[PDB]
Design a protein around this ligand. Structure first.
Ligand SMILES: *[C@@H]1O[C@H](CO)[C@@H](O)[C@H](O)[C@H]1NC(C)=O
Ligand SMILES: *[C@@H]1O[C@H](CO)[C@@H](O)[C@H](O)[C@H]1NC(C)=O
Ligand SMILES: *[C@@H]1O[C@H](CO)[C@@H](O)[C@H](O)[C@H]1NC(C)=O
Ligand SMILES: *[C@@H]1O[C@H](CO)[C@@H](O)[C@H](O)[C@H]1NC(C)=O
Ligand SMILES: *[C@@H]1O[C@H](CO)[C@@H](O)[C@H](O)[C@H]1NC(C)=O
Ligand SMILES: *[C@@H]1O[C@H](CO)[C@@H](O)[C@H](O)[C@H]1NC(C)=O
Ligand SMILES: *[C@@H]1O[C@H](CO)[C@@H](O)[C@H](O)[C@H]1NC(C)=O
Ligand SMILES: [Zn+2]
Lengths: 578, 193
């Protein structure tokens, strides 16, 4: 009767009580989201507070077991997940102040321009919106962030962590397993190596976009300089998709869009979801349950009932899976349905694992699994052998170039942005950048990594990074980088099992049970095994890699290299509009 | 032969306090039970079910309880798990049959049916066909529990939660096990030869 058996009994009882309370809370939340009434809000609050109190008491109990006398890895992982103190290490006043700061930042951000920045071609109007938003948000969020940083560093140091950035990197850490270890500081090296491999493609894409924007906005862009921040199609420049109207290679050929075929064949939400189910069954994965069809809502209730329209996939425990989405008959809803059903399938994979181990291997696998399904379902061959597109649609290389550029403007154009933001936050938390040198160094990293210049000078009173939703509301942001690699990391691994015989962007993994089994072997694991082993079970490598992305985007790379002969590739940091 | 009070009964007991009913001095029509397409599982181990209508026994017993759906596999000789260890244990050399059918519409309420209980902790595995209804508080480690549960002291009987929205593996299942006893005393249960 050592610590091992006591820990096992404790985990059994915790699993039972936690599963009960979690199902109750999830049912309350679903009832509130389907129908919006005050009573539903009250029930949601009651269930949530009960669940939170139970978790706090259980963590306090679980801190007893020293964790050094445990030889089994599963028990050690569950207890380590349960023993995390969190923000309880602080005093009462400090915790109250931190909560107040977080709440006031959230409220001040929410109650403050997404059409003046997406559908406008006026330079002055966009500059006005940019400067007004930053001046009337960051200049108010700055001191709150200044106190937030120090309080969160105190919390992290009290938990035997160097800083709060290390607290964030702790997700990817694997220890105790020979050959699959992963330190917290190796993530920086991996990210930097990957970005150094990425850079030239971004340089060529940047040159192409700059050349097109010179035509779009005369007498405002230098052929050797940078791109101003307010011309990027978004309020922040996170994505470059809205520029597609100005940077289309061949605008005389319309892109593929099969909404009209859906309307002419009398399609509906039910047909969309049965098509997705048939796709997943053809791959090899198990079919869906009757509860999914009965208990889930796939259309808009109407006007008597108000519901949140955000498409979500719910796993409520006790074998309960459902989807909340207001499905219109279009092509975007088709891909969104595929994405969310992929989420549901991933959730169903690890239903046999213990409660604390029912999640992805790390914070970047759910989205990757959904995205690869959507990419495989959006291919022209699939649309031909689904019945929408005509069964004589000989493609033309111009259409593939258009599709690749559309994908690039959303995928490649965001990696430098996320890398810069995460690195800036890491250095701020480390204390490398002093307070008075924050913003200036920020813009430095904008001119050396992503290549974006400030239209108007910014003093130290401003706080531009705080203007973004993730920074203000305390969310990790590296999740959007690693996923973007894992996605392609998976795809080329599944195309080879599917015996693909062409370019990677024309890959469809339907009617291939080997790819399904290869995916399902990783899916069933959950969080039980290190993410290195889970990645190796699919791709044969234990580390994050970039080459599949270049293999996917090679045709665009060679076309851009051929096109950019008479233009300049690269940028200089000396140029400034002001 | 009283199979109506065994199968079509209003109330079924918890798994820890499973009911035994002794069936004697009747003529048994097992065809009327086999030809029913309402049973999720009907598995006979010692003898073939088709010949259940042409044999004579002495002291057939009917054991009834309610469990989950994925725990039905544990009702078989040589199986392991919480139900097969602490709640209901069958001998390795077991002659008889097991019948199990879904009861979601009867035994699931909207807010939750917490009447059904199962034993979670015990010191030792049960011998076959042994029942305990005790409620002493389990002693996890080495410290006097002294009655009321404390730091390491767990109440051994937990409650099944049944909602009508649960999955098939978590929906209520009613289970009846027929055990055939064959010794040299005069037969009391026979089929219509
Ligand atoms: C909210 O809508 C659900 C159906 O979506 C309905 O059953 C429920 O009665 C509604 N709430 C109230 C308070 O009527
Ligand atoms: C850890 O405990 C589980 C629970 O049964 C067991 O299956 C596994 O073999 C154990 N790991 C060991 C002994 O290394
Ligand atoms: C949590 O806090 C308690 C005291 O408040 C401390 O003994 C324990 O070591 C802490 N846990 C961790 C993981 O730091
Ligand atoms: C679910 O999938 C199974 C396995 O392919 C199939 O036999 C069954 O017909 C499907 N159920 C449907 C499509 O309702
Ligand atoms: C997969 O196989 C089925 C079998 O008939 C076929 O109808 C279908 O066109 C194939 N391809 C896809 C993408 O389903
Ligand atoms: C597309 O193919 C045609 C003929 O194969 C060729 O003339 C044209 O240059 C190609 N366009 C590209 C590669 O963008
Ligand atoms: C239980 O009732 C149904 C109909 O109510 C009947 O068909 C069935 O035979 C009954 N069960 C037994 C064991 O007779
Ligand atoms: Zn996703």
């Amino acid at each position: 009767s050592t610590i091992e058996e006591q820990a096992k009994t404790f985990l059994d009882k915790f699993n039972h009580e936690a599963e009960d309370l979690f199902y109750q809370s999830s049912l309350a939340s679903w009832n509130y989201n389907t129908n919006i009434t005050e009573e539903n809000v009250q029930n949601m609050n009651n269930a949530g507070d009960k669940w939170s109190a139970f978790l706090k008491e259980q963590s306090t109990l679980a801190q007893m077991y020293p964790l050094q006398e445990i030889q089994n890895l599963t028990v050690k992982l569950q207890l380590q997940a349960l023993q995390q103190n969190g923000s309880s290490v602080l005093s009462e006043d400090k915790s109250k102040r931190l909560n107040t700061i977080l709440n006031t930042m959230s409220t001040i951000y929410s109650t403050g321009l997404n059409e003046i920045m997406a559908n406008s071609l006026d330079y002055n109007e966009r500059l006005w919106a940019w400067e007004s938003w930053r001046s009337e948000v960051g200049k108010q969020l700055r001191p709150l962030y200044e106190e937030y940083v120090v309080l969160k560093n105190e919390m992290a140091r009290a938990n035997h962590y160097e800083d709060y950035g290390d607290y964030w990197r702790g997700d990817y850490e694997v220890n105790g397993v020979d050959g699959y270890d992963y330190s917290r500081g190796q993530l920086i090296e991996d990210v930097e190596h990957t970005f150094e491999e990425i850079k030239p493609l971004y340089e060529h894409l940047h040159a192409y976009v700059r050349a097109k924007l010179m035509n779009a906005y005369p007498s405002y862009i230098s052929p050797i300089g940078c791109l101003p921040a307010h011309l990027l199609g978004d309020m922040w420049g996170r994505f470059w998709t809205n520029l597609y109207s100005l940077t289309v290679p061949f605008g005389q050929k319309p892109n593929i869009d099969v909404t009209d075929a859906m309307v002419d064949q009398a399609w509906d939400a039910q047909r969309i979801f049965k098509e997705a189910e048939k796709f997943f069954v053809s791959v090899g994965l198990p079919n869906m349950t009757q509860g999914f069809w009965e208990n889930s809502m796939l259309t808009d209730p109407g006007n008597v009932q108000k519901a949140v329209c955000h498409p979500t996939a719910w796993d409520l425990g006790k074998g309960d899976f459902r989807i909340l989405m207001c499905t219109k008959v279009t092509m975007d809803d088709f891909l969104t349905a595929h994405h969310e059903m992929g989420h549901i399938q991933y959730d169903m994979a690890y239903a046999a694992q213990p409660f604390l181990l029912r999640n992805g291997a790390n914070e970047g696998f759910h989205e990757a699994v959904g995205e690869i399904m959507s990419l495989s379902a959006a291919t022209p061959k699939h649309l031909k052998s689904i019945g929408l597109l005509s069964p004589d649609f000989q493609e033309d290389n111009e259409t593939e170039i258009n599709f690749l550029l559309k994908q690039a403007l959303t995928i490649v154009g965001t990696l430098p942005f996320t890398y810069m933001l995460e690195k800036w936050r890491w250095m701020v938390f480390k204390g490398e950048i002093p307070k008075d040198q924050w913003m200036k160094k920020w813009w430095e990293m904008k001119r050396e990594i992503v290549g974006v210049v400030e239209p108007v000078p910014h003093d130290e009173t401003y706080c531009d990074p705080a203007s973004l939703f993730h920074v203000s509301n305390d969310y990790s942001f590296i999740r959007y980088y690693t996923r973007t690699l894992y996605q392609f990391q998976f795809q080329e691994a599944l195309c080879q099992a599917a015996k693909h015989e062409g370019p990677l962007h024309k890959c469809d993994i339907s009617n291939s049970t080997e790819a399904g089994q290869k995916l399902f072997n990783m899916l069933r694991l959950g969080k039980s095994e290190p993410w290195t082993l889970a990645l190796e079970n699919v791709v044969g490598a234990k580390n994050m890699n970039v080459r599949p992305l270049l293999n996917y985007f090679e045709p665009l790379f060679t076309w851009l290299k051929d096109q950019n002969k008479n233009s300049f590739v690269g940028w200089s940091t000396d140029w400034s509009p002001y | 032969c009283p199979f109506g009070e065994v199968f079509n009964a209003t109330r079924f007991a918890s798994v820890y306090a499973w009911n035994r009913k002794r069936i004697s001095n009747c003529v048994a029509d097992y065809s009327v039970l086999y030809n029913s397409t309402s049973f999720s599982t009907f598995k006979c181990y010692g003898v073939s079910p088709t010949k259940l209508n042409d044999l004579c026994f002495t002291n057939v017993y009917a054991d009834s309880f309610v469990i989950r759906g994925d725990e039905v596999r544990q009702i078989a000789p040589g199986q392991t798990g919480k139900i097969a260890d602490y709640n209901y244990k069958l001998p390795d050399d077991f002659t008889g049959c097991v019948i199990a059918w879904n009861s979601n519409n009867l035994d699931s309420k909207v807010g939750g049916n917490y009447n059904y209980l199962y034993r979670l902790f015990r010191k030792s595995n049960l011998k076959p066909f042994e029942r305990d209804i005790s409620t002493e508080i389990y002693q996890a480690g080495s410290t006097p529990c002294n009655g009321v549960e404390g730091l390491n002291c767990y109440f051994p009987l937990q409650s099944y939660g049944f909602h009508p929205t649960y999955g098939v593996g978590y929906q209520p299942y009613r289970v009846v096990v027929l055990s055939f006893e064959l010794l040299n005393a005069p037969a009391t249960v026979c089929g219509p030869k």
